[PDB]
């Protein structure tokens, strides 16, 4: 608990431990002394640039909207004592014990744990997708975990509604997104989930590219290089098509041979997630129905969600960009509702 970490919240809270620290968010566990409850508090300074406030607002609205076992629970947002003195946002959430990046880094997981963690991840993705929401930044550190193996997705500020920026880690980015201006889609999240499932099997990232070029080499070295015009149907950009054509002609790698001790049903699911053509990639609902996850699948207990209209993030579509003060008011409205 570094002394440098300062939270301008009620003295009823006593910070306990620093859980995460980045340019956008700082997350600490803290004890709410009056009740004894230990919670997680995510602090964000949203007002130096609109970009930060936009991420904050998307995050808060998505957290408040969903009530799902695999989406981290928001308890409340602290109330500033005045609009003039509102400089940081403090999101109070249910406290989880760790995250999946730390778990994969420190624990040997059985095939049963892997089934269970990817099942829960996909169950969260299914409700987001059925609500026309894509996360766009799925990776192990954004999957929160308790010792009983409960898993909940977090970090929703890069989400978008189907129909300078913070950029999702390239290691989990779908190839069509990296290649084209392609309208981000549900399939991009399924690709990231395939990278997560592979990371669970390998105990390391499957495509740790050093840069754009290396990322594509690593991806195609495993899924095979697209070469026929049909293979390239989803790539309109002439620059992108020529670049793919300049790559070595890799065949799809025989994953069952490379990783012979992995459950073959797990490899099959993984292969269906890491497909180049987004229209042929498995959906989250189909993945929950896959044989690898039969132990946990229940078609009557996998919430589909309800569509959210683009206007839910109307602030992202203004002819004239909203000002920081404009966004401060929209965030205030979420805190007090």
């Amino acid at each position: 608990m570094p002394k440098r970490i300062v939270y301008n919240i009620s003295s009823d809270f006593q910070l306990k431990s620093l859980l995460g620290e980045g340019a956008y968010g700082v997350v600490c566990s803290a004890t709410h002394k009056p009740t004894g409850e230990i919670v997680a508090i995510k602090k964000i300074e949203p007002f130096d640039k609109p970009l930060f406030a936009l991420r904050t607002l998307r995050e808060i609205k998505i957290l408040k909207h969903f009530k799902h076992e695999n989406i981290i629970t928001i308890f409340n947002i602290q109330r500033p004592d005045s609009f003039e003195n509102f400089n940081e946002v403090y999101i109070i959430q249910e406290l989880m014990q760790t995250d999946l990046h730390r778990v994969i880094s420190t624990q040997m997981l059985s095939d049963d744990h892997i089934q269970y963690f990817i099942y829960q991840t996909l169950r969260a993705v299914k409700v987001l997708h059925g609500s026309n929401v894509i996360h766009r930044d799925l990776k192990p550190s954004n999957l929160l975990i308790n010792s009983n193996c409960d898993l909940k997705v977090c970090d929703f500020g890069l989400a978008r509604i189907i129909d300078v920026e913070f950029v999702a880690t390239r290691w989990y980015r779908a190839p069509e997104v990296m290649l084209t201006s392609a309208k981000y889609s549900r399939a991009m999240d399924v690709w990231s989930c395939g990278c997560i499932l592979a990371e669970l099997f390998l105990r390391r990232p499957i495509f740790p590219g050093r840069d754009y070029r290396h990322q594509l080499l690593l991806i195609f070295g495993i899924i095979g290089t697209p070469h026929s015009d049909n293979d390239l149907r989803c790539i309109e950009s002439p620059r992108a098509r020529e670049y793919i054509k300049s790559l070595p002609m890799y065949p799809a790698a025989p994953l069952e041979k490379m990783f012979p001790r992995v459950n073959p049903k797990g490899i099959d699911l993984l292969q269906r997630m890491l497909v180049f053509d987004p229209a042929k990639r498995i959906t989250a609902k189909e993945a929950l129905e896959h044989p690898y996850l039969q132990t946990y699948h229940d078609p009557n207990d996998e919430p589909e969600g309800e569509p959210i209209p683009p206007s839910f993030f109307e602030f992202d579509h203004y002819k004239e960009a909203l000002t920081t003060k404009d966004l401060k008011k929209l965030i205030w409205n979420e805190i007090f509702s």
Binding site: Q97, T98, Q107, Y116, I145, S147, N148, C149, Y296, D301
Partner: peptide, 12 residues
């Protein structure tokens, strides 16, 4: 609810 096998992680 469906953690049939009582899966757990020894986390400290």
């Amino acid at each position: 609810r469906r953690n049939l096998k009582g899966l757990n992680l020894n986390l400290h």
